[PDB]
From Swiss-Prot:
Cysteine pairs bridged by disulfides in the record: none
UniProt GO cellular component terms: cytoskeleton; cytosol; focal adhesion; lamellipodium; plasma membrane; T cell receptor complex
Domain PH: 132-241
Family the entry assigns: Belongs to the MRL family.
Keyword annotations: Cell junction, Cell membrane, Cell projection, Cytoplasm, Cytoskeleton, Membrane, Phosphoprotein
Predominant localisation class: membrane
Stretches assigned to coiled coil: none
GO biological process: positive regulation of cell adhesion; signal transduction; T cell activation via T cell receptor contact with antigen bound to MHC molecule on antigen presenting cell
Residues of the full protein shown: 171 to 437 of 670
Organism: Mus musculus (Mouse)
Name of the protein in question: Amyloid beta A4 precursor protein-binding family B member 1-interacting protein
């Protein structure tokens, strides 16, 4: 009905570098992380390897995550409060495309060379639907609004995280949905052992992007070890982003 005589929105984004220096970029509302990364590659003449990424820190909630390359940056940043301590960092995070470098570490003509790694990825990502890693095991889930944690068995599925309720079978029928991936972003939890008395500091966090302070809707999961955390974080990102993640990886290689 109406005409769009509006101006394309432009945001000054302060990107923090690993040496503590900053670069102020003009980021318009159409620009993906991919584009801000391309810009930073040109402005820094770095080596352009696939581990370079935008990373958001949440100093209050003590959580951090990688931006995926297809994410709209203005869209992400417009969730932050006026008085926010949150920072966008430009750094290397080699775990971001770990499944793509080493698919055998997540899915479990014989030697696992580049070619067989490629076959595995194509089967897993390039088919009609994505094959999510066969992932299941126990995790510690923080109780809502308590400094206490419950062990429960969880299972990774293409759409979400499932679990067996306390006193139910391991079979298909007994499973209930804990969380859906449409709703949440996945993050690293930092110092949850200290702040929330977590059994370990291998912690991941599940949170709607919009949430900016302490709430029960923020879910805290604690893993037995680093390898477990890695599995869950990689696996969830695969389930959430699917083929887009593969596309992101390929796109990154093209720049290296």
């Amino acid at each position: 009905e109406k005409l769009k005589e509006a101006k394309v929105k432009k945001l000054v984004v302060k990107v923090h570098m690993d040496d503590s220096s900053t670069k102020s970029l003009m980021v318009d509302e159409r620009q993906l992380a991919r584009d801000v990364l391309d810009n930073l590659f040109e402005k820094t003449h770095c080596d352009c390897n696939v581990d370079w990424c935008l990373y958001e820190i949440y100093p209050e909630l003590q959580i951090e995550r990688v931006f995926e390359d297809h994410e709209n940056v203005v869209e992400v940043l417009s969730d932050w409060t006026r008085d926010t301590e949150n920072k966008v960092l430009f750094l290397e995070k080699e775990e971001r495309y770990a499944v793509f470098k080493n698919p055998q570490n997540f899915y479990l003509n014989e030697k696992m060379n580049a070619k067989n790694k490629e076959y595995l990825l194509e089967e897993s990502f390039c088919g009609t639907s994505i094959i999510v890693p066969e992932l299941e095991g126990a995790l510690y889930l923080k109780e809502d609004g308590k400094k206490s944690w419950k062990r429960r068995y969880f299972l990774l599925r293409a759409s979400g995280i499932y679990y067996v309720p306390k006193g139910k079978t391991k079979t298909s029928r007994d499973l209930a949905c804990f969380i859906q991936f449409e709703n949440v972003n996945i993050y690293y939890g930092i110092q949850c052992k200290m702040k929330y008395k977590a059994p370990t500091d291998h912690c991941f966090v599940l949170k709607h992007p919009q949430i900016q302070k302490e709430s029960q809707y923020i879910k805290y999961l604690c893993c037995d070890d680093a390898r477990t955390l890695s599995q869950w974080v990689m696996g969830i990102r695969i389930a959430k982003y699917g083929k887009t993640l593969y596309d992101n990886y390929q796109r990154a290689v093209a720049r290296a």
